[PDB]
Amino acid sequence: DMPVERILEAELAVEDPVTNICQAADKQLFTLVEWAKRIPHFSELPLDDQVILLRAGWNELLIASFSHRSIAVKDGILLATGLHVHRNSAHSAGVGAIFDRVLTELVSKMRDMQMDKTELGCLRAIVLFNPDSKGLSNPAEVEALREKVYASLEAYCKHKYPEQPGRFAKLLLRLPALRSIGLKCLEHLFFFKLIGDTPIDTFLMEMLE
Amino acid sequence: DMPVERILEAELAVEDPVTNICQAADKQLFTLVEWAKRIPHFSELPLDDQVILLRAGWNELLIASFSHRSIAVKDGILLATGLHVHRNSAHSAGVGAIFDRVLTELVSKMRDMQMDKTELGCLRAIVLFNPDSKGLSNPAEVEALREKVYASLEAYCKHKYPEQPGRFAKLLLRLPALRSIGLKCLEHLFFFKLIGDTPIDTFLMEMLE
Amino acid sequence: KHKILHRLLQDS
Amino acid sequence: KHKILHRLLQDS
Ligand SMILES: O=C(O)CCc1nc(-c2ccccc2)c(-c2cc(C(F)(F)F)cc(C(F)(F)F)c2)o1
Ligand SMILES: O=C(O)CCc1nc(-c2ccccc2)c(-c2cc(C(F)(F)F)cc(C(F)(F)F)c2)o1
For residue A142, the one-letter residue type is V
Q: Do B156 and B120 meet the contact criterion of CB atoms below 8 Å apart?
A: no
Instruction: Give DSSP secondary structure letters for B17-77.
Output: HHHHHHHHHHHHHHHHHHHHHTSTTTTTS-HHHHHHHHHHHHHHHHHHHHHHHGGGSSSEE
Containing A86, the helix (H) or strand (E) segment is strand A84-86
Report in angstroms the alpha-carbon separations of A139 from A115, A132, A144. 29, 7, 9
In this complex, the residue of B94, B97, B188 whose CB is nearest that of residue C3 is B94
Q: How many CB atoms lie within 10 A of CB A151?
A: 15
Cα torsion at B70, B71, B74, B77 (round to 10°)?
10
Q: Do B76 and B86 meet the contact criterion of CB atoms below 8 Å apart?
A: yes
Q: Do B127 and B154 meet the contact criterion of CB atoms below 8 Å apart?
A: no
With a CB cutoff of 8 Å and minimum separation 6, the contacts of A1 are A40, A41, A148
Q: Where are the alpha helices (DSSP H) in chain A?
A: 4-13, 17-37, 47-69, 87-93, 96-102, 108-113, 117-128, 139-160, 167-172, 175-195, 202-207
Give Dmax (Cα) for chain B.
51
Instruction: Give DSSP secondary structure letters for chain D.
Output: --HHHHHHHH--
Instruction: Give DSSP secondary structure letters for B159-192.
Output: HH-TT-TTHHHHHHTTHHHHHHHHHHHHHHHHHH
Query: What is the spatial distance between Cα A11 and Cα A109, in angstroms, rounded to a whole number?
Result: 19
Experimental method: X-ray
Query: What is the spatial distance between Cα A167 and Cα A164, in angstroms, rounded to a whole number?
Result: 5
With a CB cutoff of 8 Å and minimum separation 6, the contacts of B100 are B87
Query: What is the spatial distance between Cα A11 and Cα B81, in angstroms, rounded to a whole number?
Result: 50
Cα torsion at C9, C12, D5, D8 (round to 10°)?
130
Q: Do B69 and B110 meet the contact criterion of CB atoms below 8 Å apart?
A: no
Pairing of strands A76-78, A84-86: antiparallel
Query: What is the spatial distance between Cα B58 and Cα B35, in angstroms, rounded to a whole number?
Result: 11
- CA dihedral sign of residues A150, A153, A154, A155: positive
Query: What is the spatial distance between Cα B32 and Cα B133, in angstroms, rounded to a whole number?
Result: 18
DSSP classification of residue A106: I
Tell me if A183 and B180 make a contact (CB, 8 A cut-off).
yes
> Which of B117, B169, B141 shows the shortest CA–CA distance to B4?
B117
Q: Do B65 and B57 meet the contact criterion of CB atoms below 8 Å apart?
A: no
Q: How many CB atoms lie within 10 A of CB B135?
A: 11
Report in angstroms the alpha-carbon separations of A22 from A67, A80, B12, B39, D5. 16, 11, 49, 44, 19
- Partner residues linked to B84 by β-bridges: B78
> Which of A59, A171, A179 shows the shortest CA–CA distance to A109?
A171
Q: Do B59 and B102 meet the contact criterion of CB atoms below 8 Å apart?
A: no
3-state SS assignment for residue A167 = helix
Chain C partners of B19 at a C-beta cutoff of 8 Å? none
In this complex, the residue of A150, A170, A175 whose CB is nearest that of residue B176 is A175
Q: Is the CB of A185 under 6 A from ligand 1?
A: yes
Q: Do B35 and B43 meet the contact criterion of CB atoms below 8 Å apart?
A: no
> Which of A136, A149, A113 shows the shortest CA–CA distance to A36?
A149
Of the CA atoms within 13 Å of residue B14, those in its CB half-sphere come to 27
Q: Is the CB of B80 under 6 A from ligand 2?
A: yes
For residue A14, the one-letter residue type is V
> Which of B209, B197, B207 shows the shortest CA–CA distance to B19?
B197
> Which of B140, B144, B142 shows the shortest CA–CA distance to B54?
B142
Q: In B151-170, which positions are buried (b, 16+ CB within 10 angstroms) versus exposed (e)?
A: ebbbebbeeebeeeebbbbb
Chain B partners of A168 at a C-beta cutoff of 8 Å? 169
Task: Report chain D's terminal Cα–Cα distance, integer Å.
Answer: 21
Q: Do A189 and A24 meet the contact criterion of CB atoms below 8 Å apart?
A: no
- Partner residues linked to A86 by β-bridges: A76
For chain B, list the contacting chains (3+ Cβ pairs, <8 Å): A, C
Query: What is the spatial distance between Cα A149 and Cα B30, in angstroms, rounded to a whole number?
Result: 40
Report in angstroms the alpha-carbon separations of B78 from B16, B63, B66, B179. 15, 11, 6, 21
Query: What is the spatial distance between Cα B122 and Cα A46, in angstroms, rounded to a whole number?
Result: 37
Q: Do A64 and A117 meet the contact criterion of CB atoms below 8 Å apart?
A: no
With a CB cutoff of 8 Å and minimum separation 6, the contacts of D5 are A94
3-state SS assignment for residue B201 = coil
Query: What is the spatial distance between Cα B65 and Cα B79, in angstroms, rounded to a whole number?
Result: 10
Instruction: Give DSSP secondary structure letters for B73-114.
Output: SSSEEE-TTS-EEEHHHHHHHT-HHHHHHHIIIIIHHHHHHT
| Alpha carbon of C10: minimum distance to chain B alpha carbons (Å) | 8
Long-range contacts of B143-146 (CB under 8 A, 24+ apart): B145/B2, B145/B41, B145/B42, B146/A173
Query: What is the spatial distance between Cα B144 and Cα B130, in angstroms, rounded to a whole number?
Result: 10
> Which of B172, B96, B146 shows the shortest CA–CA distance to A150?
B172
Mutate to test the interface with A, among B172, B178, B183, B187 (most CBs of A within 10 A): B172
> Which of A81, A44, A80 shows the shortest CA–CA distance to A65?
A80
DSSP classification of residue A74: S
Name the phi and psi angles at A84, rounded to 5: -105, 145
Query: What is the spatial distance between Cα B58 and Cα B33, in angstroms, rounded to a whole number?
Result: 9
- Partner residues linked to A76 by β-bridges: A86
Å from CA of A99 to ligand 1 middle: 9
With a CB cutoff of 8 Å and minimum separation 6, the contacts of B17 are B85, B89, B90, B92, B93, B95
**Resolution at which this structure was determined, Å:** 2.0
Name the phi and psi angles at A76, rounded to 5: -160, 170
Opening angle at CA A150, ends A149 and A153, nearest 5: 90
The structural domains of chain B, with segments of one domain joined by +, span 1-209
